[PDB]
Design an enzyme around this catalytic site. Structure first.
Site, PDB file in Angstrom:
ATOM      1  N   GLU A   1      31.386 121.381  17.209  1.00 56.66           N
ATOM      2  CA  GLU A   1      30.715 122.278  16.279  1.00 56.66           C
ATOM      3  C   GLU A   1      31.687 123.228  15.598  1.00 56.66           C
ATOM      4  O   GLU A   1      31.577 123.462  14.388  1.00 56.66           O
ATOM      5  CB  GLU A   1      29.631 123.080  17.002  1.00 56.66           C
ATOM      6  CG  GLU A   1      28.960 124.132  16.132  1.00 56.66           C
ATOM      7  CD  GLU A   1      27.951 124.965  16.898  1.00 56.66           C
ATOM      8  OE1 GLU A   1      27.672 124.636  18.071  1.00 56.66           O
ATOM      9  OE2 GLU A   1      27.437 125.949  16.326  1.00 56.66           O
ATOM     10  N   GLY A   2      32.641 123.775  16.348  1.00 53.64           N
ATOM     11  CA  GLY A   2      33.588 124.717  15.782  1.00 53.64           C
ATOM     12  C   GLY A   2      34.770 124.936  16.697  1.00 53.64           C
ATOM     13  O   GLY A   2      34.760 124.573  17.876  1.00 53.64           O
TER      14      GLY A   2
ATOM     15  N   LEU B   1      37.668 125.237  21.972  1.00 47.19           N
ATOM     16  CA  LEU B   1      36.349 124.861  21.491  1.00 47.19           C
ATOM     17  C   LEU B   1      35.439 126.078  21.412  1.00 47.19           C
ATOM     18  O   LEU B   1      35.582 127.042  22.168  1.00 47.19           O
ATOM     19  CB  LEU B   1      35.732 123.799  22.396  1.00 47.19           C
ATOM     20  CG  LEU B   1      35.827 122.392  21.816  1.00 47.19           C
ATOM     21  CD1 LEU B   1      35.607 121.347  22.895  1.00 47.19           C
ATOM     22  CD2 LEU B   1      34.806 122.247  20.702  1.00 47.19           C
ATOM     23  N   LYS B   2      34.503 126.029  20.468  1.00 45.35           N
ATOM     24  CA  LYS B   2      33.487 127.064  20.366  1.00 45.35           C
ATOM     25  C   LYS B   2      32.664 127.110  21.645  1.00 45.35           C
ATOM     26  O   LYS B   2      32.223 126.073  22.153  1.00 45.35           O
ATOM     27  CB  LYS B   2      32.585 126.794  19.162  1.00 45.35           C
ATOM     28  CG  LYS B   2      31.427 127.766  19.011  1.00 45.35           C
ATOM     29  CD  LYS B   2      30.326 127.164  18.149  1.00 45.35           C
ATOM     30  CE  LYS B   2      29.296 128.208  17.747  1.00 45.35           C
ATOM     31  NZ  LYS B   2      29.868 129.216  16.813  1.00 45.35           N
ATOM     32  N   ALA B   3      32.465 128.312  22.171  1.00 46.58           N
ATOM     33  CA  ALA B   3      31.697 128.472  23.396  1.00 46.58           C
ATOM     34  C   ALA B   3      30.230 128.146  23.152  1.00 46.58           C
ATOM     35  O   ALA B   3      29.690 128.370  22.066  1.00 46.58           O
ATOM     36  CB  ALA B   3      31.834 129.895  23.935  1.00 46.58           C
TER      37      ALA B   3
END
Ligand SMILES: Nc1ncnc2c1ncn2[C@@H]1O[C@H](COP(=O)(O)O)[C@@H](O)[C@H]1O
Ligand SMILES: [Cl-]
Length: 372
Positions: free
Chosen positions: A258-259, A109-111
């Site tokens: 989200e990303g 996962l995006k931090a």
């Protein structure tokens, strides 16, 4: 006499690039160690100077810290390379990646929290740095240092042992930390769990080489780090299937995403390479809602300049403006960055549709409400 950690060639190249006037100008910042009182040099380049084949850089590491020795400089701390979103560059396009990369593809996962680099020196010093700062900035370096010492006491591991193990492997641990003093991001994060997460481990070399996530987990359990969720897809087709299905669904494991950060190895020479897949929606619509909310709270003006999601944004304003007018407490927290997600979901409940369900039948509903 060990020259295996000598990096004076790179130091000379960085000093030479420092004198360049406008293109590829190396940026140098001298920091003081918070433990050893010595000094370490942090080098950084302009973001627009990254990721261009006409601009060759000596090193591509976001965050680089070298010692202050004139006869044997050593890379104190190294971060990841600068990696870009899909299609952002000619070598991150959806077709070039399959041709020029191989497995195993690792998706994290995006931090959302602040990034810190933890390394060790010969003197047992546990050097904790942050975005180009170890003096110390955001001071998240010291916050993360307190978190790390607290979690090391919880398992009885001395910081000297961690510093020595990092030094023996000549590694820097890249970690994400999420304090409760942090603001909310537009999309909710299910790994809040305030503390220190271990994002990865890199070798302190000029080139980019990072540990596999299983070794990272084994190191993290050894030092009381909060583990990070990830998934492995062996081939490019499986990864594209997962990514496109998740985008069509908007939920990874029952959460808003989200990303994704995807790590792989290039087919030629087998080198590590990262790339980001960012879900543009519903991030854009939610961020527009937040911006118009802040604009109303600061000006009591509900006119917006957007061209996308105009009807749903107007309905959101209709629902929320009475709430903001009559709840001054919510306005303060919202401006400070809190309650964004809760107010968003309150509107999504009032409208009777999920965000994805709103996005699906949006041109249909916008044209239908305009026709009436
Ligand atoms: N999990 C992550 N997702 C996205 N960017 C990251 C991550 N970890 C580190 N970064 C780095 O953080 C920088 C961008 O952060 P920001 O622009 O503040 O969102 C870039 O140098 C990224 O390579
Ligand atoms: Cl070198």
């Amino acid at each position: 006499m060990n020259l295996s950690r000598n990096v004076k060639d790179l130091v000379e190249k960085l000093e030479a690039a420092s004198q360049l006037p406008g293109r590829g100008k190396a940026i140098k910042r001298i920091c003081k160690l918070s433990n050893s009182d010595g000094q370490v040099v942090s080098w950084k380049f302009n973001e627009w100077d990254y990721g261009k084949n006409n601009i060759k850089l000596p090193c591509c590491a976001r965050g680089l810290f070298i010692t202050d020795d004139s006869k044997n400089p050593q890379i104190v701390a190294r971060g990841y390379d600068k990696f870009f979103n899909i299609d952002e560059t000619p070598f991150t396009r959806w077709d070039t990646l399959e041709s020029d990369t191989k497995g195993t593809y690792n998706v994290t996962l995006k931090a959302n929290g602040c990034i810190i680099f933890v390394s060790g020196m010969a003197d047992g010093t546990l050097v904790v740095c942050s975005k180009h700062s170890t003096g110390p900035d955001r001071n998240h370096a010291d916050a993360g240092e307190q978190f790390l010492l607290s979690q090391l006491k919880s398992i009885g591991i001395e910081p000297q042992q961690l510093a020595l193990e990092l030094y023996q492997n000549n590694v820097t641990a890249v970690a994400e930390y999420c304090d409760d003093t942090f603001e909310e991001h537009i999309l909710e994060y299910t790994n809040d769990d305030v503390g220190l997460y271990l994002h990865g481990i890199n070798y302190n070399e000029t080139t980019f080489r990072t540990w596999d996530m299983d070794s990272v987990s084994e190191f993290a359990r050894k030092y009381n780090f909060k583990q990070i969720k990830y998934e492995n897809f062996n081939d490019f087709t499986l990864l594209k299937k997962f990514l496109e299905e998740c985008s069509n669904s908007g939920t990874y494991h029952g959460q808003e995403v989200e990303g994704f950060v995807i790590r792989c190895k290039t087919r030629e020479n087998g080198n590590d390479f990262f790339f980001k897949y960012k879900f543009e929606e519903p991030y854009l619509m939610y961020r527009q809602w937040r911006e118009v909310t802040k604009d109303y709270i600061s000006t009591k003006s509900r006119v917006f300049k957007f061209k996308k999601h105009k009807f749903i944004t107007n309905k959101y304003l209709d629902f929320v403006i009475p709430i903001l007018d009559s709840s001054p407490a919510l306005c303060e927290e919202y401006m400070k960055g809190f309650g964004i997600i809760k107010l968003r979901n309150e509107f999504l409940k009032d409208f009777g549709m999920s965000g994805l369900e709103i996005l699906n039948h949006e041109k249909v509903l916008e044209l239908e409400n305009a026709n009436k």
